Design a protein around this ligand. Structure first.
Ligand SMILES: CN(Cc1cnc2nc(N)nc(N)c2n1)c1ccc(C(=O)N[C@@H](CCC(=O)O)C(=O)O)cc1
Length: 186
């Protein structure tokens, strides 16, 4: 099992969800970025594991579930069984990581990508070790009811002009955004 990563899109007001869905309208090129980052494995022959809460799962259009070319895992304590389309359910990130050390997954998984929401990001950020955050900064305020944790700049480093990520400001649907990458290692 390779690196642990978070990927998130966050508004100026730290918003990441409203009613369990994106606070902003769909951003097609941003979503394509998401697909590329989460799908590309760093080890030939292996797939990445995408971990998400139940609301994130439901927010994905059903025609695109499970996310193709990635192993999908849902984190929930409320769900009794993996939701329709998913084959893995865990109670917590540590439980999910334990699962990747098991036969079914042990030699299938490369990167782990946490893809939302709030509490699973918090879990990942509280986990010791090397962690990269791929953050899309949505450059406007949007009404939100869930939020991304603050990034501890005493611990994380911003990585300017990160390779393979566009450094210039992007725009879709009149909404500007930019890609930033941070990392910690402890
Ligand atoms: C609402 N939601 C969660 C979502 C959306 N954008 C994000 N963007 C970033 N940067 N990070 C996230 N965690 C993120 N999460 C969605 C919605 C749709 C798809 C989706 O259909 N993705 C497909 C299709 C991608 C595409 O058509 O471009 C894929 O293959 O990843 C993913 C996540």
């Amino acid at each position: 099992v390779g690196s642990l990563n978070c990927i998130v899109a966050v508004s100026q007001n730290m918003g990441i969800g409203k009613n369990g869905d994106l606070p902003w309208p769909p951003l097609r090129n941003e979503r394509r970025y998401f697909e590329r980052m989460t799908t590309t494995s760093s080890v030939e022959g292996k797939q990445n594991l995408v971990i998400m809460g139940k609301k994130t799962w439901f927010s994905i259009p059903e025609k695109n579930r499970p996310l193709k070319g990635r192993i999908n895992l849902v984190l929930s304590r409320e769900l009794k069984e993996p939701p329709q389309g998913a084959h893995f359910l865990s109670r917590s990130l540590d439980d999910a990581l334990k699962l990747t050390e098991q036969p079914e997954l042990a030699n299938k998984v490369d990167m782990v990508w946490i893809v939302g929401g709030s509490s699973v990001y918090k879990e990942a950020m509280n986990h010791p070790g090397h962690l990269k955050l791929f953050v899309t900064r949505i450059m406007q305020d949007f009404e939100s009811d869930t939020f991304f944790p603050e990034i501890d700049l005493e611990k994380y480093k911003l990585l300017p002009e990160y390779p393979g990520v566009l450094s210039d400001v992007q725009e879709e649907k009149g909404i500007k955004y930019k890609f930033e990458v941070y990392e910690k290692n402890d």
